[model samples]
Target chain A: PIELKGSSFTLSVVHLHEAEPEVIRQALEDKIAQAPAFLKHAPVVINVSGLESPVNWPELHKIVTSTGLRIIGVSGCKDASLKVEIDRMGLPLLTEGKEK
Target chain B: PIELKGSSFTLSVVHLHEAEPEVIRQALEDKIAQAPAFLKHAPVVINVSGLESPVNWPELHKIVTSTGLRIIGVSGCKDASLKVEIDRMGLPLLTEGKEK
Candidate 1:
């Protein structure tokens, strides 16, 4: 019989603030430099809670991917429009703990 | 034949800060009062990205539940210890977009 069980795994979450792509890229690069193994090609979850303005999801995705971290999906996003855009981009929103 | 499909549902994410339970309760109450239907027993996802200190997940859960919102799970939590505690609480982490 095939059975599905609960899992425990680690994912890097990048907390973003309002910043230009260049700024975000530079900052992320520096962090990656600090811990090469931890950040390099790490599976990440993006958090855009503090950002007030509507973000370009594709552009943001490009910037983060440039840092060599694979973005799994986004969390802490409450904006409907942003969610729509993200959905169109094929990025899934992840919830922590148990799936309902 | 039984088939599983991807779903898109809205979840209110409660972004938390370093505040006592009472404070969190009052704020959530006011928000709930503003839109009873929207907040009353709403399925929610908690975000602890801004909280600098360790949080009592049980206490936080209590405060949120008191507001009549059902918490589905959490996101934006990268702390190992916190994840361990939350795991024990039986909250599952959710991933958005595609399942890896």
Candidate 2:
């Protein structure tokens, strides 16, 4: 008999305020340097809650991944059009629960 | 050189309205039967947004997992002391972002 078990894990969220690849990369690099062992390749969520302009998600996605941080999904997005890019890049737009 | 890419995924949430394992189990079985291929062994999150009472998480965890679904994490828990059990169970207490 195979025994199955349930599990829950917590992942970090990288909230992006800027869309510039260079800036985002530098900032992430600085943050990672503080705790390399703990943050190395950590699974994280991208929060685009700060921006209103459409994001160049493809480029941004590449930049974050290049820094060795794994992206789990994105939350706090509102633009309806940018989803095309997000969908093209194949990212799930996660929703927050507030109806409670 | 290894190429790493960040990805976003959408997982289902099994919101609990009842605490009874048998009821929850049967309900889940019925839901799964509605769409098996889409949900089989799928990663899911448990939302306890409706429950305010202390939960028998261990028993509930086993019951849910036995149905062939993987629990990724839990959300919507307000019980401050329950963290002891959640942590003992090695589960992560996820937070939703709303400060924007």
Candidate 3:
């Protein structure tokens, strides 16, 4: 779980395996809705800690942003290919992004 | 308290009302040091919420980094003047920074 800290709220990152965009998207939406104020207008850094497939940072960004949370960056992805993808998307490194 | 959720960990964000650098710094250091693994190699977004005075983004950044956590961004600072200073230091807006 990726921990996100803001003024008085806390968000936990959970990784679920499913290539279906809707499945992933629904889970994301549910999570955000579970804590509306927690994510309300907050800048967030995502950590792609565990995944069998490379997580699409931009798509995830759009997903979370669609729910009204600002994504600052994401990390915990050590794959070279994933790194290139994230770099291309202009995300800071996971270790350099908001990790904890 | 701002709660940060990472993979398998959580860090709470606490706002200290006093501007005593030593006091705030010690509290921050203690918090991070108490959970080195939670903070080790993590990218963090700091929210300078509830400060009596304008926060020094760069100084706080240096402090957090000094303690071994990388601060990717800080927000929740509604003070326009403080925002200006943070902007000058390249920090993103609080509401727009990682809020939760």
Candidate 4:
């Protein structure tokens, strides 16, 4: 029988301190510019710990993917409706550690 | 103009307490049975906070993927060589919430 196992590896988390897509874009562009080789096509988790209310999930998701990074999931949230909306977008609500 | 942003969503972690592949496979199977709908192809972080010395990453990766799970990255590691080895294995070293 084919079997799957569990082990530890590392994932990148993009912590969101703002909600504006354009600003977010600039931030990521700056971050990625410093480490394009390391971050190119890297899979990342979006951390919404610092986001304010009324986050446009669709636009946010689009902006994140548009910048050449693959989104594995989103992290660091407490809002129920926002989570549901993310689920509607076909992404999982990822909790990386004991934080939040 | 393309951009990506950081946000938070909850990611599931599989804390490895043992290194044996069989044990891991069984454990994952048992866990997946509890919520097939929730965990099917769910991207997870492997937290090796409990693993002892001597882990075979390739076998571990295969086992985790075989059971209908995708590995986003690994966490809770302290070994430098292990980290480099994982890097060679084409997986990123993810740190979430700075609990390392």
Q: DockQ: which candidate is best?
A: 3
- lDDT, candidate 1, at B16: 73
- Interface root mean square deviation for model 2, in Å? 11.5
What digit string (tens of lDDT, one per residue) describes model 3 on residues B1-100? 1124643222234444546666666776666667776555555556566665656656766666676555555555777777777666554453332333
Alpha-carbon shift of residue B46 in model 1 (angstroms): 25
How much native contact recovery, as a fraction, does model 3 achieve?
A: 0.18
Tell how far residue B32 is off in model 1, in angstroms.
35
Instruction: State each model's C-alpha RMSD to the native.
Output: 16.2, 10.1, 9.7, 7.0
* True lDDT of residue A34, candidate 2: 76
lDDT of 1 by residue, B19-49 (tens): 7778778878887777776566665567777
Q: DockQ for each candidate?
A: 0.02, 0.05, 0.14, 0.10
TM-score of each: 0.47, 0.49, 0.46, 0.55
Provide the TM-score of chain A alone for each candidate, in the order shown: 0.85, 0.79, 0.65, 0.86
Better of 1 and 3 by lDDT: 1
Docking class of 1: incorrect
lDDT of 1 at B53: 55
- What are the per-residue Cα lDDT tens digits for candidate 3 across A55-74? 66567657656765555565
Task: Judging by TM-score against the true structure, name the best candidate.
Answer: 4
The TM-score of candidate 4's chain A against the true chain A comes to 0.86
